[PDB]
RNA sequence: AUGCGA
DNA sequence: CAAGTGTGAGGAAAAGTAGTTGGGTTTTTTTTGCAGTTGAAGACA
DNA sequence: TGTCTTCAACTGCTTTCGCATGAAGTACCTCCCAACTACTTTTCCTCACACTTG
């Protein structure tokens, strides 16, 4: 469906901690790649006080 | 409840869940005391 | 968030997703009249940004 | 979704519900349909705009 | 404002 | 081969209470018209 | 030295009159709340070993 060509099309976001490490210091490192594969979406349930 | 609290606050005690030895001594199942709201005074007063 | 912009019709975002307006996308389904409620999903509009032109062209 | 008519009223439903609208807060709001360009097809366009660009512009 | 009576 | 004093612990259960968690708002600290106007660059005497 | 001329940026407006029908900003943290299981708690109960006898 079109939500997950969506979400194939926001890609990632990137975010590193500079990544410290002590190139290192020119080219650093430590790479973090966010992103979303899959999204289901399930259809209306309630279940009574909280879970279980 | 609200005004309690805040009249009690006003007054600079501290108001929380009773301890072991408040909850003992008024005769509170210890698992109400964190319900069991307590108002207290201490030495360094409030600021 | 959904049910909001849902409450409101005030979709905003961070590209505007290439739209002239901020609001009337959404309206009361209305169900005074059953002509009325089969009305409301043949009815389609210009936008109000054009709503808002002082021209008929 | 795929409830016939029969179940649809067990339901408690309108025997013939179309359906297609949200219930947001119990209030039943519609996605209103919009008018845009046909996509992906180059129109050709006269704008006073393209001048509101600035000097030199067409 | 959305929609609407005139 | 046997009877008789002295006597400590083992055991049970409902409810509470423990530990761990989670939930949870509440809380709180896109030009699309108009007519004008100013300031502007440039020119001039 | 002094005067004139143009352009563009900015101001301010373009039905009335009523119903509607109000909604909605808000992140960091949370303590409270609801939960499952295990563990612990208060009162009570009943039997046991040993010493001494003949």
Redesign the interface.
């Known amino acids: 469906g079109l939500l997950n060509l969506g979400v194939k099309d926001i890609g990632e976001k990137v975010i590193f901690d500079g990544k410290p490490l002590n190139s290192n210091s020119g080219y650093l490192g430590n790479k973090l790649s966010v992103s979303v594969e899959q999204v289901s979406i399930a259809k209306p349930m309630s279940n009574d006080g909280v879970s279980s | 409840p609200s005004k309690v609290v805040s009249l009690f606050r006003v007054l600079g005690a501290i108001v929380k869940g009773a301890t072991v030895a408040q909850a003992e001594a008024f005769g509170i199942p210890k698992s109400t005391a964190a319900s069991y709201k307590i108002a207290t005074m201490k030495v360094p007063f409030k600021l | 968030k959904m049910?909001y912009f849902?409450?409101t019709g005030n979709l905003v975002s961070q590209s505007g997703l290439d739209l002239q307006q901020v609001s009337?996308?959404?309206?009361?389904?209305?169900?005074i009249n059953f002509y009325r409620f089969?009305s409301?999903?043949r009815?389609?509009?210009?936008?109000s940004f054009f709503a808002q032109l002082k021209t008929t062209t | 979704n795929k409830m016939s008519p029969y179940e649809l009223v067990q339901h408690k439903e309108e025997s013939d519900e179309i359906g297609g609208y949200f219930i947001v807060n119990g209030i039943e709001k519609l996605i209103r349909m919009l008018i845009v360009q046909r996509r992906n097809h180059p129109m050709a366009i006269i704008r006073p705009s393209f001048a509101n660009r600035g000097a030199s512009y067409s």
């Open positions: 049910q849902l409450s009337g996308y959404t309206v009361v389904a209305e169900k089969i409301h999903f009815m389609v509009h210009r936008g």
